């Protein structure tokens, strides 16, 4: 058998990624120039451009370091991932045949310009939108198929076509046409991270936590339980891609009720606490983590400010269930604090058996400038045999 490691690289540096460990490479992030009234970057607000891929200076200054990484692994395949975390412009773009040719004349554009071998679409997302992040409608289910199957019949023969989609129940039931869109598709990344919120301690546990449970059943997800969601939807496991997330999270029931929607008091009777004082939220602020703004911190901070604290006031620990490492801090009567949970060598190694024991087609993670020396990069191709 052989695997393949999807490496994302957040660069809108790239010298530093060690290309050699990974059988491809996308770069993010393309955005999309966009006519939705909530809109905030002036760049994508062009009306001549609408429904075009937009490309930073810095993302196209990147894009032209590509033939050197190429030397580098002559085997790497590269791709321009179009979107990310509130990035708008598809539900607009995918809706019709005017907006959807625009598109696709620009991915082809593009791929022609910087010599890439592919295109990867990180809707988030179709259908739901993204808490008023960007606009969706339900017509976006069918309009998305429609993208790919137009994109797949426009792109040159052996170009890539890849999309990423989300951990949620719904994505693969109401979201995405899963078994519609597979005939488009080289391979599916599946982001199996973003689980700390809620009622939930843990970001990418691999099955759930029993020492630290999830309360709330709506909340109660892993990694193990979304790759169920979409082979059941249909998708065969050479397809998908598990996505590792090489960050932790603080989880959001460190810092705010966790409400369990089940109830019919659901909203007044909140189903956990916060157990973070102001006192705790200073330590992560202080470190650079606004725990009113997010909740992530990069693998390479968590090492260098967390496991590497000089009063050493984070305690790593194992979940044998959860499969995955978290630190606790002492509040202030010396109790132990649950505080993040994230990867590490030995998790990412417990990731890629996995994938290996489904018969999945490979890894895929977010994100290389975040990895430590490349050590969780290096150990995934370790254990995947690339
Ligand atoms: C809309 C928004 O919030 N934008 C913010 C952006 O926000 C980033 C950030 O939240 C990042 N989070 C992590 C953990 O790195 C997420 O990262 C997410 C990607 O947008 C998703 N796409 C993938 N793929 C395709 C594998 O993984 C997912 C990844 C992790 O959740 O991208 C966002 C951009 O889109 O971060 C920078 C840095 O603080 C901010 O100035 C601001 O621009």
Redesign the pocket.
Known sequence: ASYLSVG?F?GGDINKLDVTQITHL?Y??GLIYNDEKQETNPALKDPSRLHQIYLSPKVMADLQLLPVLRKQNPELKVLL?VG????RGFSGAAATAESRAVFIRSVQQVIKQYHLDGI?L?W?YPVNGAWG?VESQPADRANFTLLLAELHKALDKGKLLTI?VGANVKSPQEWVDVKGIAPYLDYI?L?T??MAYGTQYFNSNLYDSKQWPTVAAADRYSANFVVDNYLAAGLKPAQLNL?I?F?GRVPKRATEPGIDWDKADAAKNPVTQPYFTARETAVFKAMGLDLTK?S?FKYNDIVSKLLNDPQRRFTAHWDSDAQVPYLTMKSAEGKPLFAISYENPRSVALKADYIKSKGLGGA?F??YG?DDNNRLAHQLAESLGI
């Open positions: 994302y957040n996308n993010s992030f991932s990310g975390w509130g990035a990867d990180d988030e992040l990423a990344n982001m991270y973003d996505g997330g960050y997010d992530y895929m977010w994100e975040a």
